[PDB]
Symmetry: D2
Subunit: 255 residues, 4 copies
């Protein structure tokens, strides 16, 4: 009952981190709207979880998002939290193999879809003194190899979170982000499968954390429920859920 | 029941932030040992809260801390979390008015008392796969005026948290810190009373946050319970509980 | 003679910070290509400074940038440093007054123009073991009010700098950014003139820094020459040129 | 002639990073006072470098430091820059192998010696509008394994730098720090020699940086000369001289 009576929208909620967040909010007593561009996972989740419903919505399509917000209000009467989780990591790409075109397309999803939903939701969040939770990434803060466009988009989300926190603070709306590290998800599995040695890639990924494992969607979900329900003096923070990957020296005489 | 069956030690738990943390852990189902160098507040808290007991202990005195740990194990059979909250902010002091002597004394409390309890507790935390929560400060990260020794001590705590997180990760013990901003406590009230205009000082303190108020001990307590009970992929993080004070430009042509 | 025999391209070099950077590199013995979308300032600078030449180039237009690079190589035979300074701050804008359209246009200048020039220059920088210097902003790191799109773009540049530093390190090309704070420039003057009280706006801007003044283009220029010519073990850093604005509490009881 | 007519004190200037800083300031036209607790290296440096003189001084001994300052003023008539470089890294030590005693001794050198010299020098730095440069470490920011006391001391120095920058800004005295990463020095050589495989230790140390080598004292020296002589709008900054060690994922599935 930590978040009972509340209404939450989770984008990209059909699988992976987003599905873990959906489950965490349902478990906290909230009603959850699962937004996803794919039907397969999110429709099954709706059947599985009382309190969760699925709405097909591509966050890059403004009219899709407008309908997502109006349908949430029509069906549930209020909106307390938006979790902007929908996003993508392309395969590893050397800088010279990237294009301005692919960069623009990745900005549309990872950055502008978060911007658009937040904008359309904020009038309702103001009425409820609700909050925004953006899913960024550790690599926005520390960088990553072969990922110039992805890193750029996540630096933008983390920065935007702080700007919007300033703008919305007079109105009682908090705006925070979570920066996960390596979380075992279908995306992590798909990218590893492209590598010449997928098992070596996964092993490297587990060992990049001092804790020696990857994180779970449920752990990101718990951090999101904390930020929504108990972090009433937190705004503009970047909550790291990384297993300590950013700490210390690793594998990355003076001549 | 988020932290039921667990045993928590909170230093400086008799008033202020520490008392808020005690209450939060009791409310989460834990048994709490209140450590304080003063009897007044902590003894009353023990009478008030089933599940909390008071042990007189000055964290600067090594034999006091040794007894704190052995008595916790003797009475409760396990130790899951140590919250190093005991600390002090001296009155505002210009750099030239500070002394190496006062600096050493403040390091003894704010830094070495945290080091000592952590050291003595870690064998038991390893057995329980428990965790350490240090209470640092925002000003360790961004600085503060008229507070060179205090700032120095909190930079040390935040850094130490990350070092110890690395060392203890192979053993399953997480080590994190909370960095509060302005929290309304008896210390905040005492320092404001020394200023020529205490009401102006408090007003400035509320307005240093975009949220426009100071934080509450209960909000720091919630962040501590999160870190203990639900943050299983977080180690070496600095969780900011500041109301957004670190964001944006404030009151701090090119000639 | 700190950077004698070297060839530097500075985008947005016709006025403001960019012109200060041009002058600093000329003073260091380099030959400088001034890129700007406007002729007025950059053409005068070319007449004033032996060693500087002006090339009309809008960094948002890919064929303009391709010509900038090929003309630099045709005229000077090498390329050692690219300074991506061209950028813009829109007038203050509440979140609900921004548009996805304006956001995309600002990303084209502040982020993708930097990406495009860097990409086209990197083959030549590899041959010279040269370097990239991006001009980001403090507010990418700490946020700013009424500036969600601008902040987002500068978070992206700072993050991108770190990603590209990783990718280019095996090839000996360093990639760094400078994050200025309030620098007195024609843009600062133009924005202040829109405010209801321009003099109050400028006064607030001087006092946002502990040093009590705004910075000068020449001070950003010196930091750029340092990064190019003497910082041979620095890559992926964010060099702050802010007068201390990010330090301490300012103007931004627990109920 | 970048720093001609100026007087600089460098602590721990007899070898390693400190000697590189001495040489850089001499090369910039300054007169340099080499402070060291050991005579061997610093006396030879005085014979080698016109413009440098050696004064025996243990920064942990307050009367030694008082004499250092008074002798600098007696001999040269002014004081423009203090570089607090003296410091030590103990051998790798597991947390349970450290002592409060060793921790206090390391704080005396790495933190309080910097505090003491700065305090005694500041009246003269105010007269000259001079500046303070503290040599901290990257690991104060990101942590390090088997080094809890060392990390703690460097977190303190970096934090203290920001506090003092705030306090001294009204008086025109800037206060900055440099955070080196792995720099090839006699200390690095001594510690590697203790390890079971010294060559593996050095190899790991070179490869912890994306640039693939360790840094040189001369590179830290250049950053110090920049901060003294050209960074007139920088105060309270942490200048990283690390070869990119803090960037990206390294060597540090969800169960
Ligand atoms: N997995 C990790 O290690 C990791 C680490 C850091 C950050 N993240 C971030 O977490 C988020 C989730 O990643 P994941 O690993 O769970 O990915 P995933 O690919 O497993 O799941 C993403 C979900 O979002 C949906 N989605 C994609 N594009 C969409 C669109 N236009 N509109 C609506 N829904 C859309 C997908 O259909 C999918 O259900 C992303 O923002 C990612 O950048 C992931
Ligand atoms: N109040 C704030 O705005 C603020 C902000 C950031 C960080 N903090 C930190 O939070 C912690 C608590 O501060 P507070 O405002 O609640 O202070 P407080 O003075 O109100 O309470 C501190 C408690 O610690 C106890 N204590 C002091 N020295 C001790 C010792 N040697 N051994 C055992 N107990 C001891 C005191 O008796 C008291 O009960 C401190 O570490 C402080 O630095 C406070
Ligand atoms: N002035 C500050 O306080 C401040 C603070 C932090 C960062 N910055 C950054 O510094 C940079 C310079 O800012 P400024 O204050 O000197 O601005 P300015 O407006 O005074 O000068 C910018 C220059 O860039 C040129 N330019 C603009 N769009 C261009 C394009 N498409 N192609 C080529 N040239 C183009 C302009 O014509 C102008 O000559 C920007 O990236 C800005 O974000 C400025
Ligand atoms: N070498 C690195 O990789 C590295 C990395 C980051 C930071 N640092 C820091 O750089 C500084 C210099 O380190 P280094 O590697 O050059 O060390 P070093 O041991 O090679 O040289 C240190 C010098 O300081 C002197 N010194 C020691 N104690 C002193 C005292 N009490 N009073 C006066 N002089 C004293 C020594 O005699 C020696 O000449 C230290 O603060 C260290 O923490 C070094
Ligand atoms: O999606 C991934 C990811 C990994 C970590 C993150 F912090 C993040 O935001 C995203 C992921 C999954 C599997 C492999 C990789 C990866 C591996 C090597 C690379 O060079 C790369 O750019 C990405 N990234
Ligand atoms: O204890 C205080 C405090 C305030 C903020 C913190 F982040 C913190 O760690 C401690 C506090 C309370 C009341 C006034 C002040 C204060 C005001 C002006 C000063 O110059 C100063 O050094 C401290 N600090
Ligand atoms: O260009 C400006 C600027 C100022 C500071 C920066 F760090 C930066 O990257 C850009 C600037 C100049 C004059 C006024 C303002 C400004 C004032 C109030 C605002 O709310 C705002 O968004 C911007 N910004
Ligand atoms: O002095 C060293 C050092 C290395 C890096 C730093 F950033 C720093 O401030 C100091 C150094 C030199 C050689 C080996 C080591 C080292 C290696 C393994 C360790 O576990 C450790 O604590 C230190 N540190
Ligand atoms: O596909 C990789 C992983 O994705 C998500 O974490 C799923 O919850 C988990 O069951 C699966 O193993
Ligand atoms: O003394 C200041 C404040 O300290 C703590 O926050 C107490 O819980 C609160 O009741 C009091 O107002
Ligand atoms: O227009 C504001 C300022 O812009 C730049 O800093 C110019 O160099 C300076 O002369 C002018 O005062
Ligand atoms: O002892 C290791 C190194 O220390 C310093 O860097 C010296 O300048 C260098 O000559 C030596 O190789
Ligand atoms: Na359902
Ligand atoms: Na009790
Ligand atoms: Na010319
Ligand atoms: Na000499």
């Amino acid at each position: 009952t930590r978040y009972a009576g509340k209404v939450v929208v989770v984008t990209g909620g059909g699988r992976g981190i987003g599905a873990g967040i959906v489950r965490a909010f349902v478990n906290s007593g909230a009603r959850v709207v699962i937004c996803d561009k794919d039907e397969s996972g999110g429709r099954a989740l709706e059947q599985e979880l009382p309190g969760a419903v699925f709405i097909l919505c591509d966050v890059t399509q403004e009219d899709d998002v407008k309908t997502l917000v109006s349908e949430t209000i029509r069906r549930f009467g209020r909106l307390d939290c938006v979790v902007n989780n929908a996003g993508h990591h392309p395969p590893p790409q050397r800088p010279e193999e990237t294009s301005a075109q692919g960069f623009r397309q990745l900005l549309e999803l990872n950055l502008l879809g978060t911007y658009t939903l937040t904008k359309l939701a904020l009038p309702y969040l103001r009425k409820s003194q609700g909050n925004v939770i953006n899913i960024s990434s550790l690599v926005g803060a520390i960088g990553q190899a072969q990922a110039v466009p992805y890193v750029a988009t996540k630096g933008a989300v983390t920065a935007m979170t702080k700007a919007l926190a300033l703008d919305e603070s007079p109105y009682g709306v908090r705006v925070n982000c979570i920066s996960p590290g390596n979380i075992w998800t279908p995306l992590w599995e798909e990218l590893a499968a492209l590598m010449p040695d997928p098992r070596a890639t996964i092993r490297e990924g587990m060992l990049a954390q001092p804790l020696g494992r990857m994180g779970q969607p449920a752990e990101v979900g718990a951090a999101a429920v904390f930020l929504a329900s108990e972090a009433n003096f937190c705004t503009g923070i970047e909550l790291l859920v990384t297993g300590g990957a950013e700490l210390g020296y690793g594998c990355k005489p003076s001549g």
